[PDB]
């Protein structure tokens, strides 16, 4: 499955949205997720990474 950053940030304020974006970077570094972004400023989609096997729902 997959998680959309823009959907996670719906209804958030600037500091909250920035922290969720930053969490994507950290979770990618930790290999809990993989990231795709089609073009600059498009949605950013997380999918399961090699180093975490639970659910993505729980990761956020």
């Amino acid at each position: 499955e997959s998680i959309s950053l823009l959907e996670l940030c719906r209804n958030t304020n600037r500091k909250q949205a920035a922290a969720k974006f930053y969490s994507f970077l950290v979770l990618k570094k930790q290999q809990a997720i993989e990231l795709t972004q089609e073009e600059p400023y498009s949605d950013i989609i997380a999918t399961p990474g090699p180093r975490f096997h639970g659910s993505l729902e729980v990761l956020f």
Binding site: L5, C9, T12, N13, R14, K15, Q16, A17, A18, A19, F21, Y22, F24, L25, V26, K28, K29, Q31, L35, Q37, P40, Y41, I44
Partner: protein
Amino acid sequence: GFLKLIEIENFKSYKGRQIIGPFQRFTAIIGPNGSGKSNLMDAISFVLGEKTSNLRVKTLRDLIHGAPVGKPAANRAFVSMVYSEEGAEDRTFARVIVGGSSEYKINNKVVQLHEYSEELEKLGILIKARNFLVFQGAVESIAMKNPKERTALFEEISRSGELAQEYDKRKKEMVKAEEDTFEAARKRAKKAKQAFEQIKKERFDRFNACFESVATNIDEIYKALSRNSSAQAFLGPENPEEPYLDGINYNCVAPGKRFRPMDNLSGGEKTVAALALLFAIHSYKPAPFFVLDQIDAALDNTNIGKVANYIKEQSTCNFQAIVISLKEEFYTKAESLIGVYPEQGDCVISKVLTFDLTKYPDA
């Protein structure tokens, strides 16, 4: 104009071809601990003509992805800057590593470094002076300069210091000719001081043109950084007639204190006073964009928001701000975020993501 985007190919950890940006008027580069952010700073320095010895390598070839460990991804690498300007076509400035040395290009036309530097200078980008860069530790460096070290800095940035030796030598000749003084001796002394007053007037005018601009701007900057109408900042030459000969005094009225030399301040108060001087100095010769490498590392939680809001305000009109930032209270003031992350590989791979913060409300 504007730094619109950076295009990178196989430069340090930026494997493959990558678009960095587009940049907004205020963009923060952020990411978890890693080679990526500093490598992106190096890419910006590199495309703006930085010397090999200042790019954390011993050979230009080692900037190619994988070259440091003998596994180069390619025999070429490049960084390209797209510079935009309202009413004009975009201009592209590129530096390519070809055969182990630099090839400079403007709009894909190969040029020599002299012309590359000249064309950037016409845009307000001074690659030898690095007027676009606030290096890590620049705040603390300014904070520690005594009055005479301030005068040294003003002579450097105003290019009045380029007239120092001629001033000293013309003054030496004038003193000799005056010491001698039948009528021809009077004539030689008169011409001696006239030629000296010429270089004195010229050194004064170059110094004064820079200093008076910085001195005129520093008060409002210090008020804006302090977010306090009662804060006051003052620069003054110890020797008004010839400021280059003595120190530049710097007194502040911190928002609760009394008129005192910046020396007599401490903590975040002295940091905000040093920041005001740093930004006032950069308001002379200002580049169209300003790259602040981890300026927020020098800040604590009593003034990080104030400095971030100052950059936010200035970025709407006076310059484009590109900040490499570790602290959320600073980078959440930006319009967009460039997030750097690592990818697993034979060598460290860096990639980026772009995020628009303007879509969301404040606190």
